[PDB]
Amino acid sequence: SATPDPAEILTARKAVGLSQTAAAALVHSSLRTWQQWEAGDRRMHPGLWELFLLKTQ
Protein backbone atom coordinates (compact mmCIF):
# COMPACT_ATOMS: atom_id res chain seq x y z
CA SER A 1 0.00 0.00 0.00
CA ALA A 2 1.40 3.41 -1.04
CA THR A 3 1.88 6.21 1.44
CA PRO A 4 0.62 9.56 0.09
CA ASP A 5 3.09 12.22 -0.94
CA PRO A 6 3.32 15.19 1.46
CA ALA A 7 2.10 17.50 -1.32
CA GLU A 8 -0.91 15.21 -1.90
CA ILE A 9 -1.75 15.35 1.82
CA LEU A 10 -1.59 19.14 1.86
CA THR A 11 -3.62 19.39 -1.38
CA ALA A 12 -6.37 17.11 -0.03
CA ARG A 13 -6.56 19.05 3.25
CA LYS A 14 -6.73 22.40 1.43
CA ALA A 15 -9.40 21.05 -0.94
CA VAL A 16 -11.91 20.66 1.93
CA GLY A 17 -10.78 23.82 3.77
CA LEU A 18 -9.63 22.06 6.95
CA SER A 19 -7.03 23.26 9.41
CA GLN A 20 -4.16 20.95 10.28
CA THR A 21 -5.77 20.45 13.72
CA ALA A 22 -9.15 19.51 12.21
CA ALA A 23 -7.49 17.03 9.82
CA ALA A 24 -5.45 15.47 12.64
CA ALA A 25 -8.59 15.08 14.75
CA LEU A 26 -10.38 13.37 11.87
CA VAL A 27 -7.71 10.65 11.85
CA HIS A 28 -7.31 10.39 15.65
CA SER A 29 -3.81 11.92 15.52
CA SER A 30 -1.97 14.88 17.04
CA LEU A 31 -1.37 18.23 15.34
CA ARG A 32 2.39 17.61 15.46
CA THR A 33 1.90 14.29 13.65
CA TRP A 34 -0.11 15.92 10.85
CA GLN A 35 2.59 18.60 10.56
CA GLN A 36 5.29 15.91 10.32
CA TRP A 37 3.31 14.21 7.54
CA GLU A 38 3.04 17.44 5.54
CA ALA A 39 6.74 18.13 6.09
CA GLY A 40 7.75 14.65 4.98
CA ASP A 41 9.35 13.97 8.39
CA ARG A 42 7.14 10.88 8.89
CA ARG A 43 5.17 8.78 6.41
CA MET A 44 1.38 8.72 6.75
CA HIS A 45 0.01 5.20 7.29
CA PRO A 46 -1.99 4.22 4.16
CA GLY A 47 -4.96 3.24 6.31
CA LEU A 48 -5.05 6.66 7.96
CA TRP A 49 -4.81 8.23 4.48
CA GLU A 50 -7.79 6.14 3.35
CA LEU A 51 -9.72 7.14 6.49
CA PHE A 52 -9.05 10.82 5.81
CA LEU A 53 -10.25 10.54 2.22
CA LEU A 54 -13.37 8.61 3.28
CA LYS A 55 -14.29 11.16 5.95
CA THR A 56 -13.69 14.22 3.75
CA GLN A 57 -15.49 13.13 0.56
Numbering used by the authors: 3 to 59
Sentences from the paper on this structure:
Many acr genes form an operon with genes encoding transcriptional regulators, called anti-CRISPR-associated (Aca) proteins. Aca10 is the most recently identified Aca family that is suggested as a transcriptional regulator by controlling the expression of acrIC7 and acrIC6 in P. citronellolis and in other analogous contexts. In conclusion, Aca10 from P. citronellolis is a dimeric DNA binding protein and a likely transcriptional repressor of the acrIC7-acrIC6-aca10 operon. Aca10 forms a dimer in solution and the dimeric form is critical for binding specific DNA.
